[PDB]
């Protein structure tokens, strides 16, 4: 069964645990390119009463650097906010809990904005069918495939 974080039947406890960054996408491609601040490799999501603790690592010159962020629930169900390289809010438009998680985030910094979409998997990779479903979801948000980057062969330290 699939759900959206903004849907009535969403069960946030079910996204707890191990996750891996499979694909990242953005309408500002530089943000997820090699030295981008949003080229983030997820490791786990810890679900709390009104927050999610996100554990990630970034990579630079082949060196991994850990980072944790706390995302707080906002006034809208299914929406979380977090301060990181500006102000971010995000939702999970689609997850099946057991294989994949698709997130949609809006970043605002210095009076600007951009959209970030991420495809996360329970294992370090996902099937081609799930990756195509993600490309379709990015298209629905106006993000071209040329701005979608598969990081499945670069998500391990
Ligand atoms: Na730039
Ligand atoms: Na694989
Ligand atoms: Na579509």
UniProtKB/Swiss-Prot annotation:
Pfam families hit by this protein: Lipocalin
Q: Which SUPFAM superfamilies match?
A: Lipocalins
Q: In which tissues is it expressed?
A: Abundant in the urine of adult male mice but absent from that of females.
* Entry GO terms, CC: cytosol; extracellular space; nucleus
* One GO-annotated biological process of the protein: mitochondrion organization
Question: GO molecular function of the protein, one example?
Answer: pheromone binding
Known role: Binds pheromones that are released from drying urine of males. These pheromones affect the sexual behavior of females.
Q: Could you say which protein family the record assigns here? A: Belongs to the calycin superfamily. Lipocalin family.
Q: What name does UniProt use for this protein?
A: Major urinary protein 1
């Amino acid at each position: 069964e699939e759900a959206s974080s903004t849907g009535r039947n969403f069960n946030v406890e079910k996204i707890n645990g191990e996750w891996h960054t499979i694909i990242l996408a953005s309408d500002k491609r530089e943000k997820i390119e090699d030295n981008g601040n949003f080229r983030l490799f997820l490791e786990q999501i810890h679900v709390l009463e009104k927050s999610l603790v996100l554990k990630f690592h970034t990579v630079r010159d082949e060196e991994c650097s850990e980072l944790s962020m706390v995302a707080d629930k906002t006034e809208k169900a299914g929406e979380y906010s977090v301060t990181y390289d500006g102000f971010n809010t995000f939702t999970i438009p689609k997850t099946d809990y057991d294989n994949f998680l698709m997130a949609h985030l809006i970043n605002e910094k210095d009076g600007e904005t951009f959209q970030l979409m991420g495809l996360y998997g329970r294992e370090p990779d996902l099937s081609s069918d799930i990756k195509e479903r993600f490309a379709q979801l990015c298209e629905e948000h106006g993000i071209l495939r040329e701005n979608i980057i598969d990081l499945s062969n670069a998500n391990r330290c």
